[PDB]
């Protein structure tokens, strides 16, 4: 009966954050306890919500999305930013509602040689709506020259990967992030804290 | 070839103040603008993409603005560190063109140069050559003109200045010409003159010197 | 995390085929992102070389340069090179590597290229000596003449006279050689009493010149 929140932060992948995943959670009592029971989160921030109610509160759903970052953008997840990951990977609303929880994975996510797979949108049109997912790989027109689906003068593919190699600095060694999103809709409410 | 010129392409301004810097194209270019600041013997840094972005990790009093064929680069709350060479870049066709730059320095009480002339070394002309020195110090107006003078004649040609950056403490600069000729060259003129005009002076300075005395 | 590290001469000839070769390290070049060359001649504006994608291959270059450069990615040491045939007077500039052609983020340090038809070659240091007891402050300097390869460096009684000097910028001579004056302001009261040495190294060659600067 209790919310699965151990399949979203002990997840073994992780996903891009412009393939950014989501896990809408329902129908469970959710134990925040071993959250903020927890040392190993550098980054735990809290909007228009609290722990305490947390605990006592339900939500009609709540959205738990999870993707990996290097150190210095954590700070773009969050409400009114700017930058190449909330421009153009994660947007996060200006009114949102919810928890912000990073930690680093320079254990897990860099390999020795540096690691690839993770990407991020370096290019668009226009900026991210918020709460989208930009999966597009089509090539980038930087300029006035067409691109015809190659690549042409000023014209890039749009998704770049992070070089994480162990050794890198902090501001650019990989970080794990978890966006929870509590959302109260006009219907009964599946999602409780254990103070209820 | 778009051609891409900066209209101020120098301008002083005190800490606190606001600035505005304007960048042309010679066609429109949309907003196909960079804006970047380079500070002397260092790579340019990123500040301002698509002419209006501005780059993660720069504080916001740089703003960028501007469409077509006219762009803005505007500095709000003057810092020391903002004091550098700022260039703007279009990526809307082959050729990617900058403009010319435009060099910010501090503003400064006006301050008169020192003038100092310093004749061949014998040493030197023992080698066969003979180089005449004169020196210009702590003038805060960058801009000065150095005329070399030999037996009354204005001397154009045989003579190469240069300047250093502002100075970090007193915020003024110092140049420095020389007049290069043979050791027979030298030795067919007897008087050296180093002639110099500056906004710090009612009337130009001549430090001279007779070779041989 | 991704540095960039001109590498080559500085020491090229008219008509020759200039050769940089930009070291990455951080990143390697062939998994993703787009990698160019900017030049800037000295005391003027930026210019654009050419570029290529990491990822496949595809090189654009100038088009006033097309048919002089090459940039290509080496095999297996993660870097690429550039090569500029027939270069003239036109070409001596600060060349730097950089990344991410459109909005170029990341930048190396620059490496001076002096197109002459000089050698790599000592200075000759010759002193600039005081005449005043002219000004409350005397001033003294070295004259540093006549070294190609741009690299030297100036300094006052070994590092400890900073205060009042002025080491200028070089300025290229017709001959192809480099000039430049490093000059100290100091008190009247001094001269004929504290010795002023300027210590000049110049690294390209194997050059190290101490000079004693005294009243004439
Ligand atoms: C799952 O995550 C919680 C929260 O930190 C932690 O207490 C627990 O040890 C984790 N379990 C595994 C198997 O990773």
Same mark, same amino acid.
């Given at each position: 009966?209790?919310?699965?929140?151990?399949?979203?932060?002990?997840?073994?992948?992780?996903?891009?954050?412009?393939?950014?995943?989501?896990?809408?959670?329902?129908?469970?009592?959710?134990?925040?306890?071993?959250?903020?029971?927890?040392?190993?989160?550098?980054?735990?921030?809290?909007?228009?919500?609290? !722990?305490?109610?947390?605990?006592?509160?339900?939500?009609?759903?709540?959205?738990?999305? #999870?993707?990996?970052?290097?150190?210095?953008?954590?700070?773009?997840?969050?409400?009114?930013?700017?930058?190449?990951?909330?421009?153009?990977?994660?947007?996060?609303?200006?009114?949102?509602? +919810?928890?912000?929880?990073?930690?680093?994975?320079?254990?897990?996510? &860099?390999?020795?040689?540096?690691?690839?797979?993770?990407?991020?949108?370096?290019?668009?049109?226009?900026?991210?709506?918020?709460?989208?997912?930009?999966?597009?790989?089509?090539?980038?027109?930087?300029?006035? =020259? !067409?691109?015809?689906?190659?690549?042409?003068?000023?014209?890039?593919?749009?998704?770049?990967?992070?070089?994480?190699?162990?050794?890198?600095? %902090?501001?650019?060694?990989?970080?794990?992030?978890?966006?929870?999103?509590?959302?109260?809709?006009?219907?009964?409410?599946?999602?409780? +804290?254990?103070? &209820? | 070839?778009?051609?891409?010129?900066?209209?101020?392409?120098?301008?002083?301004?005190?800490?606190?103040?606001?600035?505005?810097?304007?960048?042309?194209?010679?066609?429109?270019?949309?907003?196909?603008?960079?804006?970047?600041?380079?500070?002397?013997?260092?790579?340019?840094?990123? $500040?301002?993409?698509?002419?209006?972005?501005?780059?993660?990790?720069?504080?916001?009093?740089?703003?960028?603005?501007?469409?077509?064929?006219?762009? =803005?680069?505007?500095?709000?709350? $003057?810092?020391?560190?903002?004091?550098?060479?700022?260039?703007?870049?279009?990526?809307?066709?082959?050729?990617?063109?900058?403009?010319?730059?435009?060099?910010?320095?501090?503003?400064?009480?006006?301050?008169?140069?020192?003038?100092?002339?310093?004749?061949?070394?014998?040493?030197?002309?023992?080698? +066969?050559?003979?180089?005449?020195?004169?020196?210009?110090?702590?003038?805060?107006?960058?801009?000065?003109?150095?005329?070399?003078?030999?037996?009354?004649?204005?001397?154009?040609?045989?003579?190469?200045?240069?300047? =250093?950056?502002?100075?970090?403490?007193?915020?003024?600069?110092?140049?420095?010409?020389?007049?290069?000729?043979?050791?027979?060259?030298?030795?067919?003129?007897?008087?050296?003159?180093?002639?110099?005009?500056?906004?710090?002076?009612?009337?130009?300075?001549?430090?001279?010197?007779?070779?041989?005395? | 995390?991704?540095?960039?590290?001109?590498?080559?001469?500085?020491?090229?000839?008219?008509?020759?085929?200039? #050769?940089?070769?930009?070291?990455?390290?951080?990143?390697?070049?062939?998994?993703?992102?787009?990698?160019?060359?900017?030049?800037?001649?000295?005391?003027?504006?930026?210019?654009?070389?050419?570029?290529?994608?990491?990822?496949?291959?595809? =090189?654009?270059?100038?088009?006033?340069?097309?048919?002089?450069?090459?940039?290509?990615?080496?095999?297996?040491?993660?870097?690429?090179?550039?090569?500029?045939?027939?270069?003239?007077?036109?070409?001596?500039?600060?060349?730097?590597?950089?990344?991410?052609? !459109?909005?170029?983020? %990341?930048?190396?340090?620059? /490496?001076?290229?002096? /197109?002459?038809?000089?050698?790599?070659?000592?200075?000759?240091?010759?002193?600039?000596?005081?005449?005043?007891?002219?000004?409350?402050?005397?001033?003294?300097?070295?004259?540093?003449?006549?070294?190609?390869?741009? !690299?030297?460096?100036?300094?006052?009684?070994?590092?400890?006279?900073?205060? +009042?000097?002025?080491?200028?910028?070089? %300025?290229?001579?017709?001959?192809?050689?480099?000039?430049?004056?490093?000059?100290?302001?100091?008190? &009247?009261?001094?001269?004929?009493?504290?010795?002023?040495?300027?210590?000049?190294?110049?690294?390209?060659?194997?050059?190290?010149?101490?000079?004693?600067?005294?009243?004439?």
């Amino acid at each position: 009966n209790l919310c699965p929140f151990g399949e979203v932060f002990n997840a073994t992948r992780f996903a891009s954050v412009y393939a950014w995943n989501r896990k809408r959670i329902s129908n469970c009592v959710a134990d925040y306890s071993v959250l903020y029971n927890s040392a190993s989160f550098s980054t735990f921030k809290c909007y228009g919500v609290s !722990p305490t109610k947390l605990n006592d509160l339900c939500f009609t759903n709540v959205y738990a999305d #999870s993707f990996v970052i290097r150190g210095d953008e954590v700070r773009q997840i969050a409400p009114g930013q700017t930058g190449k990951i909330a421009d153009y990977n994660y947007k996060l609303p200006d009114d949102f509602t +919810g928890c912000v929880i990073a930690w680093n994975s320079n254990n897990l996510d &860099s390999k020795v040689g540096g690691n690839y797979n993770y990407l991020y949108r370096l290019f668009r049109k226009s900026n991210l709506k918020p709460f989208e997912r930009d999966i597009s790989t089509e090539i980038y027109q930087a300029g006035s =020259t !067409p691109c015809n689906g190659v690549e042409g003068f000023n014209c890039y593919f749009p998704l770049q990967s992070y070089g994480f190699q162990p050794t890198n600095g %902090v501001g650019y060694q990989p970080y794990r992030v978890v966006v929870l999103s509590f959302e109260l809709l006009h219907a009964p409410a599946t999602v409780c +804290g254990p103070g &209820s | 070839d778009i051609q891409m010129t900066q209209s101020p392409s120098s301008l002083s301004a005190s800490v606190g103040d606001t600035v505005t810097i304007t960048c042309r194209a010679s066609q429109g270019i949309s907003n196909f603008l960079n804006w970047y600041q380079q500070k002397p013997g260092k790579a340019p840094k990123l $500040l301002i993409y698509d002419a209006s972005r501005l780059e993660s990790g720069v504080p916001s009093r740089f703003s960028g603005s501007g469409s077509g064929t006219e762009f =803005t680069l505007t500095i709000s709350s $003057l810092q020391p560190e903002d004091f550098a060479t700022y260039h703007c870049l279009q990526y809307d066709s082959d050729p990617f063109i900058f403009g010319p730059g435009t060099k910010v320095d501090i503003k400064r009480t006006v301050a008169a140069p020192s003038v100092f002339i310093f004749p061949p070394s014998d040493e030197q002309l023992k080698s +066969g050559t003979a180089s005449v020195v004169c020196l210009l110090n702590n003038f805060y107006p960058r801009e000065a003109k150095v005329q070399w003078k030999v037996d009354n004649a204005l001397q154009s040609g045989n003579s190469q200045e240069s300047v =250093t950056e502002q100075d970090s403490k007193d915020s003024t600069y110092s140049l420095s010409s020389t007049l290069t000729l043979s050791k027979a060259d030298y030795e067919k003129h007897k008087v050296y003159a180093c002639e110099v005009t500056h906004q710090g002076l009612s009337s130009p300075v001549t430090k001279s010197f007779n070779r041989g005395e | 995390q991704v540095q960039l590290q001109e590498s080559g001469p500085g020491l090229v000839k008219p008509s020759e085929t200039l #050769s940089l070769t930009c070291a990455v390290s951080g990143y390697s070049i062939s998994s993703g992102y787009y990698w160019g060359w900017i030049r800037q001649p000295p005391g003027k504006g930026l210019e654009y070389i050419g570029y290529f994608s990491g990822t496949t291959g595809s =090189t654009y270059y100038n088009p006033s340069l097309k048919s002089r450069v090459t940039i290509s990615k080496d095999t297996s040491k993660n870097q690429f090179s550039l090569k500029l045939n027939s270069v003239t007077a036109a070409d001596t500039a600060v060349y730097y590597c950089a990344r991410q052609p !459109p909005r170029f983020d %990341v930048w190396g340090p620059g /490496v001076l290229v002096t /197109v002459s038809t000089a050698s790599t070659k000592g200075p000759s240091v010759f002193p600039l000596a005081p005449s005043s007891r002219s000004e409350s402050t005397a001033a003294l300097g070295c004259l540093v003449k006549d070294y190609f390869p741009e !690299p030297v460096t100036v300094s006052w009684n070994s590092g400890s006279l900073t205060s +009042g000097v002025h080491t200028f910028p070089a %300025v290229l001579q017709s001959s192809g050689l480099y000039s430049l004056s490093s000059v100290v302001t100091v008190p &009247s009261s001094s001269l004929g009493t504290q010795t002023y040495v300027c210590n000049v190294n110049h690294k390209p060659s194997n050059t190290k010149v101490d000079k004693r600067v005294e009243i004439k």
